[PDB]
Design a protein around this ligand. Sequence first.
Ligand SMILES: *[C@@H]1O[C@H](CO)[C@@H](O[C@@H]2O[C@H](CO)[C@@H](O)[C@H](O)[C@H]2NC(C)=O)[C@H](O)[C@H]1NC(C)=O
Ligand SMILES: *[C@@H]1O[C@H](CO)[C@@H](O[C@@H]2O[C@H](CO)[C@@H](O)[C@H](O)[C@H]2NC(C)=O)[C@H](O)[C@H]1NC(C)=O
Ligand SMILES: *[C@@H]1O[C@H](CO)[C@@H](O[C@@H]2O[C@H](CO)[C@@H](O)[C@H](O)[C@H]2NC(C)=O)[C@H](O)[C@H]1NC(C)=O
Ligand SMILES: *[C@@H]1O[C@H](CO)[C@@H](O[C@@H]2O[C@H](CO)[C@@H](O)[C@H](O)[C@H]2NC(C)=O)[C@H](O)[C@H]1NC(C)=O
Ligand SMILES: CO[C@@H]1O[C@H](CO)[C@H](O)[C@H](O[C@H]2O[C@H](CO)[C@H](O)[C@H](O)[C@H]2O)[C@H]1O
Ligand SMILES: CO[C@@H]1O[C@H](CO)[C@H](O)[C@H](O[C@H]2O[C@H](CO)[C@H](O)[C@H](O)[C@H]2O)[C@H]1O
Ligand SMILES: CO[C@@H]1O[C@H](CO)[C@H](O)[C@H](O[C@H]2O[C@H](CO)[C@H](O)[C@H](O)[C@H]2O)[C@H]1O
Ligand SMILES: CO[C@@H]1O[C@H](CO)[C@H](O)[C@H](O[C@H]2O[C@H](CO)[C@H](O)[C@H](O)[C@H]2O)[C@H]1O
Ligand SMILES: [Ca+2]
Ligand SMILES: [Ca+2]
Ligand SMILES: [Ca+2]
Ligand SMILES: [Ca+2]
Ligand SMILES: [Mn+2]
Ligand SMILES: [Mn+2]
Ligand SMILES: [Mn+2]
Ligand SMILES: [Mn+2]
Lengths: 236, 236, 236, 236
Amino acid sequence: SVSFTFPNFWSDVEDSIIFQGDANTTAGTLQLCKTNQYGTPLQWSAGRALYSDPVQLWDNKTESVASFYTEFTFFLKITGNGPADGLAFFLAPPDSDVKDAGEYLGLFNKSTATQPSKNQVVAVEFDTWTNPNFPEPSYRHIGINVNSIVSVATKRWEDSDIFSGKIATARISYDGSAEILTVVLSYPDGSDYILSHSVDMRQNLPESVRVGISASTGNNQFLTVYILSWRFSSNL
Amino acid sequence: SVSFTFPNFWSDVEDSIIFQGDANTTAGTLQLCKTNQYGTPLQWSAGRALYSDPVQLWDNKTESVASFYTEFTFFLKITGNGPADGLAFFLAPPDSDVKDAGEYLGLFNKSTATQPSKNQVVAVEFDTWTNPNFPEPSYRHIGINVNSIVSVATKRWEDSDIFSGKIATARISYDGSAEILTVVLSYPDGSDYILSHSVDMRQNLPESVRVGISASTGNNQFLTVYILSWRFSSNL
Amino acid sequence: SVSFTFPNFWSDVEDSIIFQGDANTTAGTLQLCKTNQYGTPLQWSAGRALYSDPVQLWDNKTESVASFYTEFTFFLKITGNGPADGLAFFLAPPDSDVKDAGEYLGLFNKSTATQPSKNQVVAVEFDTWTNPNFPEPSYRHIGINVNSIVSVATKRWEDSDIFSGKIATARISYDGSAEILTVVLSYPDGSDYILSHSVDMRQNLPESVRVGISASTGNNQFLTVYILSWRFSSNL
Amino acid sequence: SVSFTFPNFWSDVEDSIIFQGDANTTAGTLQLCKTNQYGTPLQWSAGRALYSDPVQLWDNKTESVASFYTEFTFFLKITGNGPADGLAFFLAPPDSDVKDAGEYLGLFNKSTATQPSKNQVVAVEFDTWTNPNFPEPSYRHIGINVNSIVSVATKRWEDSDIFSGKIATARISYDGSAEILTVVLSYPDGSDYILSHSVDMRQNLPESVRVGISASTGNNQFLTVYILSWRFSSNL
Ligand SMILES: *[C@@H]1O[C@H](CO)[C@@H](O[C@@H]2O[C@H](CO)[C@@H](O)[C@H](O)[C@H]2NC(C)=O)[C@H](O)[C@H]1NC(C)=O
Ligand SMILES: *[C@@H]1O[C@H](CO)[C@@H](O[C@@H]2O[C@H](CO)[C@@H](O)[C@H](O)[C@H]2NC(C)=O)[C@H](O)[C@H]1NC(C)=O
Ligand SMILES: *[C@@H]1O[C@H](CO)[C@@H](O[C@@H]2O[C@H](CO)[C@@H](O)[C@H](O)[C@H]2NC(C)=O)[C@H](O)[C@H]1NC(C)=O
Ligand SMILES: *[C@@H]1O[C@H](CO)[C@@H](O[C@@H]2O[C@H](CO)[C@@H](O)[C@H](O)[C@H]2NC(C)=O)[C@H](O)[C@H]1NC(C)=O
Ligand SMILES: CO[C@@H]1O[C@H](CO)[C@H](O)[C@H](O[C@H]2O[C@H](CO)[C@H](O)[C@H](O)[C@H]2O)[C@H]1O
Ligand SMILES: CO[C@@H]1O[C@H](CO)[C@H](O)[C@H](O[C@H]2O[C@H](CO)[C@H](O)[C@H](O)[C@H]2O)[C@H]1O
Ligand SMILES: CO[C@@H]1O[C@H](CO)[C@H](O)[C@H](O[C@H]2O[C@H](CO)[C@H](O)[C@H](O)[C@H]2O)[C@H]1O
Ligand SMILES: CO[C@@H]1O[C@H](CO)[C@H](O)[C@H](O[C@H]2O[C@H](CO)[C@H](O)[C@H](O)[C@H]2O)[C@H]1O
Ligand SMILES: [Ca+2]
Ligand SMILES: [Ca+2]
Ligand SMILES: [Ca+2]
Ligand SMILES: [Ca+2]
Ligand SMILES: [Mn+2]
Ligand SMILES: [Mn+2]
Ligand SMILES: [Mn+2]
Ligand SMILES: [Mn+2]
């Protein structure tokens, strides 16, 4: 059983959050990627914020899988028409470090991003940029990734919400018995996105893992991701 | 596309909410079942609060199913050791009225509660009382009901949370493409319940329906359910 | 050095709040005056909710009036054009009990309401009814009462806010050194009422007092006051 | 009759807020003074954020000082034992620009900071550093400044709250009729600071003024002030 709550990141979350890549706290929020003194986000950057304590995903001698829930708010600071690349919530082995930037969201490497058998990561992505390098929706989208940058299921993410300049609330749940991952993205306006898909953690990740949030950028400099709050709870 | 938000029920929600059975507003909240002048809940009562506007669940000539999300907070005013019977969120034909009280949660009739083919209702229940009349967990529980008072899937609901005297937050989502219903129950302490199950609305409900919240009581008078807030959104 | 916080009144505030007259808790709120089973407020009723623990207002040889701050939210459920009589925050001797209803706000008796030397109560009133019995604004108003139902200072209270059907936030502060009482009434719309006046508690109240909120009604039955939250802190 | 509300500073408040000195927005907040790429605050810096629209303070032949109320939250990011210099809310002529840093809080010049007749500024200061250059409390404090860096009235500000690492809420009100300025500083823990003092804006400021918040630093580099939200309303 694991749980934590960050109403904000004003306190010294140093002894509770592992910062990878560019990740760090900025004025009570988590800023995954670096910006210059002029507030302009740097190109090809990546960062991740992983919770220190590990999570018992499942048991082998019991085959019993754990359930978990996470909720976090984020703001997309967009100053252009081509924001990239987005952010993602994810689970990975405790020693997993930041990977490639750009379309890989700091989760995979260029060489194996499309090879599930060569990865150990499950994530829900909020993709603000359609990439031609591999198969994916031609529109902004939300998706569930199982050991691959190519989502197993996606949902269209409206630009009116992406460029809304409003605080979004992401909720992700997983029922260990049913083996179902669900994501709900909500905007203060009146729009909710719902995406669910069956996924068995036992065949995609080790018994013990860490949870975190990742973000990255490519050539454009029109986007900076900020996480305002974050809580999580898990039960075997 | 349908959506609404009730941060509270202080306003005159008369021209937006259909009250069934005992249901009504009480000091900014929805109180489904009646209590006396001494605050004591009456026995064998039932009540439902349905949103006026109908929701397009699915399309026949398109086979396309809609997705929706709902969130609401509730408080369990318990004054004894045997609180019953609980509450539930549900979807049913627009002309569906309150049914039997007690273990039926105002959703089914005594005679057909266990006969799916004789019902038109999908619900997520928060059952505070184990009934011997039909099969169900011997402990307090949360469940998904598909045209029957006998849940297709359940999750244990800890008494420490039920008798916590705290405001609970219920979240229910449905992905029309994946045909998955998910429920998350959260307590300000640090406990989250997650329950997901595949369910196809097309074979359980008509194209157009109404959403609502229901509650009922039996012989005991140790429980009074109050809904503090409620919002919903749906998209075809 | 006394302080307390009530984010709501869902818990059993029995062993912390002294209920006088009709006062009691109702669905997470404080309802000072009673209503029938039809939700209709009874005529000529009065009620007060005083915090159990007494507050040290001042001292003699020590010479040091205590400072305090209190904040609370309330809703005016109005169903007619003649709401009466309103509510008030007050300080009085620990053994002070509810007084007369109607225009006296449960704070004074009919025979001495206009005689300062015969009373022991300082209060901030939110008067929704202009009375001709004694001098007072011919319009709804907010006021500072020092041992009298006749305010020493008042501020007009716009009807657009009174019948707004929105939750109001009251803030009352007192600087024991400057001997100044300040009241600020705020509405979510965009209106703030400010009223300050010099007042020396030492010559109007005993060294030890209790703080509370009261309300009352007269002939009309168009108003029911509800207090949703309440907090207070003091320092000698 | 001017009013504005900033629940945060995530939006482009460019066409609503005049940034002076180092002031600017940082991740949804206002950062008055600059910090390097290492998050270290620069020495001897100053910045102010004034609301664009001017406020009508008072009139002559009309005789009617306007009343106003303002509320804002701020966080003191402290990394050392000598945080300086603090922040302040103020009113000054519309064309007033940032002044000297250090102990002057960006509000006065070194040569005239102690000369009321040479200044046009009324403010509430939150001084985290006792200066020996001029008379002031030998302990951290809150104060009301009338055309001088030497407060006419002050209140001790406990270090437990200053180094608390929690978000503080400041509330400032002014009754134009009573000519009374009141400040209330509140911490989520359970401490409220109250300070009131008589002040006539008519003899200290022009008929039209601008309101804002300022901050500054000296030699030490242990403090960085952040304003998370800010709202204000006024009425002639
Ligand atoms: C406020 O109302 C409550 C209603 O609950 C009163 O307490 C109840 O009193 C009845 C008997 O009159 C008991 O059967 C209940 O068990 C009590 N309820 C609780 C929660 O204890 C209470 O007396 C009223 N307070 C005042 C001052 O009249
Ligand atoms: C919900 O409760 C309200 C109580 O406010 C009921 O309204 C009252 O109804 C009675 C008759 O039943 C009238 O005499 C009163 O004038 C009504 N009160 C007000 C303020 O108008 C209402 O009937 C209840 N709703 C339902 C569906 O039962
Ligand atoms: C506050 O900082 C912002 C940083 O964004 C400054 O505005 C930027 O100015 C640079 C050039 O110096 C431009 O490339 C950016 O496009 C601007 N950003 C935005 C959002 O417009 C701004 O000048 C600073 N304000 C002050 C008073 O110094
Ligand atoms: C996150 O940002 C902070 C900025 O506050 C970094 O802390 C500074 O690190 C430099 C050296 O890298 C030190 O000289 C400063 O003294 C530090 N500042 C403070 C206030 O202690 C921190 O290094 C960053 N964390 C990571 C993992 O990069
Ligand atoms: C014009 O298309 C761009 O070509 C680049 C090589 O010339 C590169 O493929 C780029 O994609 C990269 O940047 C975008 C936008 O910033 C995004 O971050 C991608 O993930 C990243 O690979 C093409 O857009
Ligand atoms: C002692 O068991 C009770 O027997 C009753 C008949 O004598 C009846 O079955 C009752 O159940 C009813 O009340 C409970 C508790 O209030 C609950 O509401 C059930 O749904 C309702 O059927 C038995 O508990
Ligand atoms: C018909 O008007 C009533 O006259 C009374 C004397 O005959 C008395 O003034 C009464 O006022 C009372 O009711 C109002 C409205 O409820 C209010 O509560 C007053 O405080 C109360 O004295 C008149 O309505
Ligand atoms: C070494 O102490 C410094 O002496 C200065 C004169 O030589 C001056 O008093 C200085 O104070 C300055 O820095 C502090 C801390 O940052 C504060 O900002 C004061 O306002 C500023 O004048 C002393 O630190
Ligand atoms: Ca992409
Ligand atoms: Ca049951
Ligand atoms: Ca009156
Ligand atoms: Ca100083
Ligand atoms: Mn993608
Ligand atoms: Mn059940
Ligand atoms: Mn009055
Ligand atoms: Mn000072």
